[PDB]
Design a protein around this motif. Structure first.
Motif, PDB file in Angstrom:
ATOM      1  N   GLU A  35       0.792  -1.228   0.000  1.00  0.00           N
ATOM      2  CA  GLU A  35       0.000   0.000   0.000  1.00  0.00           C
ATOM      3  C   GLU A  35       0.813   1.262   0.000  1.00  0.00           C
ATOM      4  N   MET A  36       1.904   1.318   0.753  1.00  0.00           N
ATOM      5  CA  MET A  36       2.815   2.474   0.806  1.00  0.00           C
ATOM      6  C   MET A  36       3.530   2.827  -0.471  1.00  0.00           C
ATOM      7  N   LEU A  37       3.775   1.794  -1.295  1.00  0.00           N
ATOM      8  CA  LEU A  37       4.384   1.913  -2.607  1.00  0.00           C
ATOM      9  C   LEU A  37       3.570   2.758  -3.515  1.00  0.00           C
ATOM     10  N   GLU A  38       2.219   2.557  -3.436  1.00  0.00           N
ATOM     11  CA  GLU A  38       1.300   3.311  -4.281  1.00  0.00           C
ATOM     12  C   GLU A  38       1.259   4.761  -4.009  1.00  0.00           C
ATOM     13  N   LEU A  39       1.207   5.082  -2.695  1.00  0.00           N
ATOM     14  CA  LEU A  39       1.245   6.318  -2.052  1.00  0.00           C
ATOM     15  C   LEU A  39       2.551   7.016  -2.195  1.00  0.00           C
TER      16      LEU A  39
ATOM     17  N   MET B  90       2.698  27.490   3.523  1.00  0.00           N
ATOM     18  CA  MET B  90       2.029  27.021   4.700  1.00  0.00           C
ATOM     19  C   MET B  90       0.904  26.100   4.274  1.00  0.00           C
ATOM     20  N   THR B  91       0.467  25.218   5.259  1.00  0.00           N
ATOM     21  CA  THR B  91      -0.598  24.194   5.189  1.00  0.00           C
ATOM     22  C   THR B  91      -0.173  22.985   4.442  1.00  0.00           C
ATOM     23  N   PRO B  92       0.097  21.811   5.150  1.00  0.00           N
ATOM     24  CA  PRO B  92       0.714  20.688   4.409  1.00  0.00           C
ATOM     25  C   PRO B  92      -0.200  20.109   3.453  1.00  0.00           C
ATOM     26  N   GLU B  93      -1.543  20.155   3.741  1.00  0.00           N
ATOM     27  CA  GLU B  93      -2.514  19.550   2.917  1.00  0.00           C
ATOM     28  C   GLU B  93      -2.683  20.210   1.580  1.00  0.00           C
ATOM     29  N   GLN B  94      -2.591  21.559   1.542  1.00  0.00           N
ATOM     30  CA  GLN B  94      -2.648  22.251   0.280  1.00  0.00           C
ATOM     31  C   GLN B  94      -1.508  21.957  -0.629  1.00  0.00           C
ATOM     32  N   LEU B  95      -0.294  21.887  -0.035  1.00  0.00           N
ATOM     33  CA  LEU B  95       0.977  21.590  -0.753  1.00  0.00           C
ATOM     34  C   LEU B  95       1.028  20.232  -1.389  1.00  0.00           C
ATOM     35  N   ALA B  96       0.504  19.263  -0.573  1.00  0.00           N
ATOM     36  CA  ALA B  96       0.449  17.904  -0.980  1.00  0.00           C
ATOM     37  C   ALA B  96      -0.477  17.595  -2.207  1.00  0.00           C
ATOM     38  N   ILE B  97      -1.694  18.211  -2.235  1.00  0.00           N
ATOM     39  CA  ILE B  97      -2.749  18.214  -3.312  1.00  0.00           C
ATOM     40  C   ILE B  97      -2.182  18.906  -4.484  1.00  0.00           C
ATOM     41  N   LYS B  98      -1.471  20.119  -4.309  1.00  0.00           N
ATOM     42  CA  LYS B  98      -0.988  20.959  -5.354  1.00  0.00           C
ATOM     43  C   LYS B  98       0.099  20.279  -6.185  1.00  0.00           C
ATOM     44  N   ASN B  99       1.124  19.564  -5.480  1.00  0.00           N
ATOM     45  CA  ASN B  99       2.258  18.905  -6.131  1.00  0.00           C
ATOM     46  C   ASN B  99       1.941  17.382  -6.191  1.00  0.00           C
TER      47      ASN B  99
ATOM     48  N   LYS C  73      -3.813  13.429  -3.459  1.00  0.00           N
ATOM     49  CA  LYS C  73      -5.091  13.713  -2.816  1.00  0.00           C
ATOM     50  C   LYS C  73      -5.005  13.602  -1.327  1.00  0.00           C
ATOM     51  N   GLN C  74      -5.482  14.620  -0.569  1.00  0.00           N
ATOM     52  CA  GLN C  74      -5.377  14.892   0.910  1.00  0.00           C
ATOM     53  C   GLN C  74      -3.953  14.855   1.330  1.00  0.00           C
TER      54      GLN C  74
ATOM     55  N   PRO D  29      -0.566  12.434   1.485  1.00  0.00           N
ATOM     56  CA  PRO D  29       0.033  11.169   1.172  1.00  0.00           C
ATOM     57  C   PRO D  29       0.765  10.607   2.326  1.00  0.00           C
ATOM     58  N   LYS D  30       1.252  11.486   3.215  1.00  0.00           N
ATOM     59  CA  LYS D  30       2.010  11.154   4.456  1.00  0.00           C
ATOM     60  C   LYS D  30       1.094  10.392   5.424  1.00  0.00           C
ATOM     61  N   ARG D  31      -0.158  10.807   5.597  1.00  0.00           N
ATOM     62  CA  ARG D  31      -1.100  10.288   6.484  1.00  0.00           C
ATOM     63  C   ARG D  31      -1.465   8.894   6.195  1.00  0.00           C
ATOM     64  N   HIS D  32      -1.705   8.617   4.855  1.00  0.00           N
ATOM     65  CA  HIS D  32      -2.115   7.352   4.327  1.00  0.00           C
ATOM     66  C   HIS D  32      -1.074   6.331   4.620  1.00  0.00           C
ATOM     67  N   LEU D  33       0.228   6.719   4.434  1.00  0.00           N
ATOM     68  CA  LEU D  33       1.403   5.923   4.603  1.00  0.00           C
ATOM     69  C   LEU D  33       1.552   5.471   6.080  1.00  0.00           C
ATOM     70  N   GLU D  34       1.309   6.469   6.975  1.00  0.00           N
ATOM     71  CA  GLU D  34       1.490   6.360   8.408  1.00  0.00           C
ATOM     72  C   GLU D  34       0.445   5.362   9.028  1.00  0.00           C
ATOM     73  N   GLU D  35      -0.864   5.436   8.640  1.00  0.00           N
ATOM     74  CA  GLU D  35      -2.018   4.619   9.058  1.00  0.00           C
ATOM     75  C   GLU D  35      -1.712   3.212   8.677  1.00  0.00           C
ATOM     76  N   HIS D  36      -1.114   3.073   7.449  1.00  0.00           N
ATOM     77  CA  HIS D  36      -0.784   1.745   6.946  1.00  0.00           C
ATOM     78  C   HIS D  36       0.243   1.040   7.757  1.00  0.00           C
TER      79      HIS D  36
END
Lengths: 52, 188, 192, 152, 155
Positions: free
Chosen positions: E92-96, E110-119, E122-123, E125-132
């Motif tokens: 799962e982390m590979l995809e992310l 500023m705002t990690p979520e905006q930066l992450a969506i912009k470059n 979606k939402q 990518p760090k969070r998804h990785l961490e939950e996994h």
């Protein structure tokens, strides 16, 4: 060719076939995680340059 | 009647030795019947029970005049030898804590007082019937008991259980404290 | 305890009536309220069967006998026990579970925000549960020990089930080793 | 004939050839609809084929009980020679009825799945799950059991 | 959608029993449906309060302490199953990780979520990785703690 997955021993004059070993899985998951982090580190440094 | 108890008591012991089912030698001794009232036939009868439990060929063998008296013991001499061997093996697994239920073939042979070769076949027949379970590693030469059956009911045997239960009480206390200790700040 | 009061007819009347409030409420049997299981209970067990379709004897206590449920379920059994003792009438226990229907679940879930066995919300939540299983295990060990002595001295009937159950724990043989897990997290935390 | 065949306890080929030979091989009967055992013309071949069958039964029983057995020790048991036993095992393994690992050097026969240290840990995990269920049950029987002192 | 109510008769309305009810408590009016509130209020009833008291013993029985529930915590899961899971989780982390390499290049405002969506990603990518990792780490960590403890205790 690995068309039977053994090893041939010419020093003794026997053919040994590779038995099932314990998990490779543990090493492989570590290997995969560390490679992805190395790509990331390269991106992580560049923005950081701004601080110092 | 007095005489009736004496006849039935004799056959009951004889049956008991033949047994593949019997793991209640300890119960026969415990029951008043055999011990309290003895006759000349009954003197040997209780002794043969004793010899099984102990599972030694040396104790068993002296009693051999008895083997001739009944054809039942004389005929199935193989089952008797196999029984005493297997019972001694069970007592050793039982004496020893939950660290090892492994015994070597050598150690089994010493208890049994039967040759190492024949012990290896005998142990296999007991496995085959299903009295005992485990594995035989003949590289190591150990029979590792995975499973052992309900043992003879004597007092000593009640006591063997206490040893492990008591020990277990102290290791759990120690350990319970280590589990509470780790992040005690947050259980909420 | 060989003097007590009970109204048998009442059992019969109640059966019909409960059906109107819910269809799932019919005479299943009787409840006992601790502390132990007595000889005196056996007289009522007999009687209950006639009144009820065959009854169950569930003992619901006010305080757990372990650390989990305060309920035990029993069925009357006759078994031969040998040590110098004759055939005994006893109550053989069968294990219990928890479970409910949708109405019950709704109210308990909104009302609950307690600490529980585990809620689950963190890693740390999980340790509370681990503490509780191990503490439970301590409790059972004490009851069996004091009893082993009582069997040896008194010549209390030897139930085959108890001697066999304890034996099994000892024979299985503990073995445990190699364990590992990931360590991906650092780049991520560092990333934030 | 029934009894030896039915037990999964050890048999030895030779004992059987004589035992069966006296009683069973004779196959007297009055009906013309059967007299077959070894008395008949195909009956002779049927007894020849029995060597193979008995020895194969020895292999099955040993596969379960034993995990590892020395080579020397297995040939005695089967009633086969060193070359024959090693050879007979490969045929069985490919055909798939038992699984052995054969050292053609007379070293060892492993009826196990290929050993891993990992494997053993898992087998204990299952035992542990059972072990807990047993301990919870037992506590209950204790409470009823303590009350009584009139039945001793 | 449980209210306590009181009957409004012709007699009750003339007396002025309806305000009289609100007095002596915290006061409660219903809500569900518009037609049911206007109609109900006039013809059918006046509404009043329900509050709840349940004792600590009632809470203890409410909770459903359960014997297997705590026991599971100790109960050891397969070693191969942890290894297998460790490997699955990494997948799962590979995809992310593709989205995550791109997101990290520029996150200089500023705002990690905006930066992450912009470059791209979606939402978070760090969070998804961490939950996994967290779910796998949680099961493996408790089982190791439990395993070492049980082996020593039982032996």
């Amino acid at each position: 060719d690995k068309k039977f997955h053994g090893i041939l021993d010419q020093g003794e004059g026997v053919l040994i076939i590779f038995d099932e070993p314990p998990v490779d899985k543990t090493y492989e998951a570590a290997l995969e995680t560390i490679q992805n982090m190395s790509k990331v580190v390269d991106s992580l440094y560049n923005k950081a340059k701004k601080l110092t | 009647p007095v005489s009736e108890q004496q006849e039935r008591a004799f056959t009951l012991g004889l049956a008991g030795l033949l047994g593949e089912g019997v793991f209640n030698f300890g119960e026969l001794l415990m029951h008043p019947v055999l011990e309290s009232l003895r006759n000349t036939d009954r003197q040997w009868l209780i002794d043969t029970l004793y010899a099984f439990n102990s599972g030694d060929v040396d104790r068993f063998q002296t009693l051999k005049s008895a083997w001739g008296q009944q054809p039942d013991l004389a005929a199935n001499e193989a089952q008797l030898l196999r029984k005493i061997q297997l019972l001694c093996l069970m007592e050793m697994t039982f004496t020893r804590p939950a660290n090892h239920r492994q015994l070597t073939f050598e150690e089994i042979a010493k208890s049994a007082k039967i040759t190492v070769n024949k012990v290896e076949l005998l142990v296999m027949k007991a496995l085959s019937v299903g009295l005992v379970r485990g594995s035989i590693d003949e590289v190591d030469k150990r029979v590792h008991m995975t499973w052992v059956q309900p043992r003879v009911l004597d007092l000593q045997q009640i006591k063997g259980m206490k040893d492990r239960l008591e020990l277990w009480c102290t290791d759990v206390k120690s350990m319970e404290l280590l589990v509470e200790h780790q992040a005690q700040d947050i259980l909420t | 305890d060989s003097v007590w009061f009970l109204d048998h007819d009442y059992l019969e009347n109640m059966y019909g009536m409960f059906k109107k409030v819910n269809a799932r409420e019919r005479i299943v049997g009787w409840y006992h309220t601790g502390p132990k299981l007595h000889k005196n209970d056996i007289a009522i067990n007999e009687l209950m069967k006639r009144y009820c379709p065959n009854s169950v004897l569930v003992i619901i206590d006010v305080k757990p006998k372990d650390l989990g449920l305060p309920t035990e379920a029993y069925i009357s059994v006759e078994e031969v026990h040998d040590d110098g003792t004759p055939t005994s009438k006893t109550f053989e226990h069968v294990t219990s579970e928890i479970g409910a229907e949708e109405a019950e679940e709704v109210g308990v879930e909104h009302l609950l925000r307690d600490i529980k066995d585990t809620t689950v919300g963190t890693l740390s939540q999980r340790i509370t549960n681990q503490v509780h299983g191990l503490k439970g295990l301590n409790s059972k060990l004490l009851d069996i020990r004091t009893y082993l002595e009582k069997v040896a001295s008194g010549k209390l009937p030897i139930n085959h089930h108890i001697i066999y159950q304890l034996q099994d724990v000892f024979n299985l043989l503990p073995d445990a080793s190699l364990q590992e897990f990931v360590k991906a997290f650092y780049l991520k935390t560092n990333d934030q | 004939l029934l009894k030896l065949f039915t037990t999964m306890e050890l048999m030895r080929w030779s004992t059987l050839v004589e035992d069966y030979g006296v009683e069973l091989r004779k196959g007297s009967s009055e009906t013309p609809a059967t007299d077959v055992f070894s008395s008949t013309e195909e009956g002779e071949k049927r007894w020849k084929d029995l060597k193979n069958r008995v020895v194969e039964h020895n292999i099955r029983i040993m596969a379960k009980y034993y995990t590892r057995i020395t080579m020397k020790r297995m040939a005695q048991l089967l009633d086969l020679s060193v070359d024959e036993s090693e050879a007979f095992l490969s045929n069985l393994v490919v055909n798939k009825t038992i699984f052995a690992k054969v050292d053609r050097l007379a070293g060892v026969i492993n009826f196990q799945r290929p050993k891993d240290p990992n494997n053993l840990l898992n087998d204990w995990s299952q035992k542990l799950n059972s072990l807990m269920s047993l301990v919870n049950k037992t506590t209950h029987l204790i409470a009823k059991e303590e009350m009584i002192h009139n039945l001793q | 959608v449980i209210d306590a109510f009181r009957l409004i008769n012709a007699n009750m309305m003339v007396l002025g029993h309806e305000p009289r009810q609100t007095t002596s408590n915290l006061g409660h009016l219903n809500k569900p449906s518009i037609q049911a509130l206007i109609h109900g209020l006039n013809r059918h009833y006046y509404s009043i309060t329900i509050n709840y008291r349940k004792n600590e013993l009632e809470q203890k029985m409410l909770l459903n302490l359960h014997k297997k529930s705590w026991m599971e915590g100790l109960t050891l899961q397969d070693y191969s199953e942890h290894c297998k899971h460790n490997e699955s989780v990494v997948k799962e982390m590979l995809e992310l990780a593709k989205n995550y390499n791109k997101a990290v290049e520029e996150e200089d405002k500023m705002t990690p979520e905006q930066l992450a969506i912009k470059n791209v990603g979606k939402q978070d990518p760090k969070r998804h990785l961490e939950e996994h990792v967290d779910v796998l780490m949680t099961s493996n960590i408790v089982q190791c703690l439990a395993a070492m403890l049980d082996t020593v205790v039982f032996k």
